Amino acid sequence: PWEQTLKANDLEVKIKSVGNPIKGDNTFVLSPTLKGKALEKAIVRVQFMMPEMPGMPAMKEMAQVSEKNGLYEAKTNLSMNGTWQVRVDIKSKEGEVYRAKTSLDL
Amino acid sequence: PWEQTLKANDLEVKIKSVGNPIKGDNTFVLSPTLKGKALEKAIVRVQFMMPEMPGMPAMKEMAQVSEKNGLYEAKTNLSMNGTWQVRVDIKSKEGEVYRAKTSLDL
Ligand SMILES: [Ag+]
Ligand SMILES: [Ag+]
Ligand SMILES: [Ag+]
Ligand SMILES: [Ag+]
């Protein structure tokens, strides 16, 4: 199952697909940590984007994010195969802002 | 079956996959024409590339290309799914150079 660990100094964000990523409805779980400590009650946004291509417009999907105790479930529908750019935006409960990027080659 | 017609002024290049494109060995058939006339005995090169991006280093494959009577068969191995950029370079028998580009989602 697809997973990437994103590192930005003291910020680590593991993002893992729940099951294998598919065309259709997808669930990913993100575990953002600062010096290994879970970021709870954070604003977590996850965007999946495909640039414009022959026969299709640029596509942007914002995931629906829910938290349980520092684990964030990001639900999205990926309507087609191909490369999706993944952008993770985090505002901690303390107000610090972080961004991290990866990619999903579906 | 994936299929596209690339138009570049007086150049047209029809390209069609053999079967559905997916990870592994892939075959494409290319039919280049200049003002409707088949381009025979040309040098046809086809590059498949996934650009460098967050979480994936750049990947590049050059297809093995053969001609029979103006039809060019391009064989390549695409080791992962996702979006592949397709670049077609043609040097006609007369010495004219052409370049056309598209992409396909695996
Ligand atoms: Ag798309
Ligand atoms: Ag696409
Ligand atoms: Ag790749
Ligand atoms: Ag990629």
Side-chain angles (χ1 to χ4, degrees), chain B residues 3 15 19 22 25 30-33 40 47-48 51 53 60 90 100 105:
Chain B
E3 143 166 37
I15 178 174
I22 195 166
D25 289 330
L30 293 81
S31 309
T33 60
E40 295 185 59
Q47 177 191 266
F48 297 79
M53 62 189 47
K60 194 162 323 204
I90 302 174
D105 299 319

Side-chain angles (χ1 to χ4, degrees), chain A residues 31-36 38-40 67 69-72:
Chain A
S31 46
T33 59
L34 190 76
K35 303 183 172 25
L39 275 61
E40 294 186 86
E67 182 195 355
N69 298 321
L71 287 189
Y72 299 81

Side-chain angles (χ1 to χ4, degrees), chain A residues 15 27 32 51 53 55 67 71-72 74 87 98 100:
Chain A
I15 178 173
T27 302
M53 284 186 39
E67 182 195 355
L71 287 189
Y72 299 81
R87 198 185 82 187
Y98 312 85

Side-chain angles (χ1 to χ4, degrees), chain B residues 38-40 42-87:
Chain B
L39 232 58
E40 295 185 59
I43 303 311
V44 177
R45 300 141 56 208
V46 188
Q47 177 191 266
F48 297 79
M49 177 189 80
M50 298 187 74
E52 132 83 27
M53 62 189 47
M56 189 208 76
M59 295 169 77
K60 194 162 323 204
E61 301 287 341
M62 285 313 274
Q64 165 234 293
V65 181
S66 67
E67 182 200 354
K68 196 181 181 186
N69 300 322
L71 201 63
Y72 299 81
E73 174 173 14
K75 280 183 175 291
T76 186
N77 184 274
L78 305 182
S79 66
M80 69 172 59
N81 291 318
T83 300
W84 286 86
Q85 300 307 318
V86 178
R87 192 186 81 186

Side-chain angles (χ1 to χ4, degrees), chain A residues 11 13 15 17-36 38-40 42-59 61-74 76-80:
Chain A
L11 179 84
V13 174
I15 178 173
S17 179
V18 178
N20 291 309
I22 58 169
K23 197 176 76 172
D25 289 329
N26 284 270
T27 302
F28 304 83
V29 292
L30 293 81
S31 46
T33 59
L34 190 76
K35 303 183 172 25
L39 275 61
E40 294 186 86
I43 302 310
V44 175
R45 299 178 255 124
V46 188
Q47 157 186 299
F48 298 79
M49 175 263 265
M50 182 181 305
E52 179 188 5
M53 284 186 39
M56 68 186 61
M59 292 175 78
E61 308 294 343
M62 289 324 188
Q64 311 299 285
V65 180
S66 68
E67 182 195 355
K68 193 186 200 195
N69 298 321
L71 287 189
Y72 299 81
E73 175 183 86
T76 187
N77 179 274
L78 303 180
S79 67
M80 65 183 12

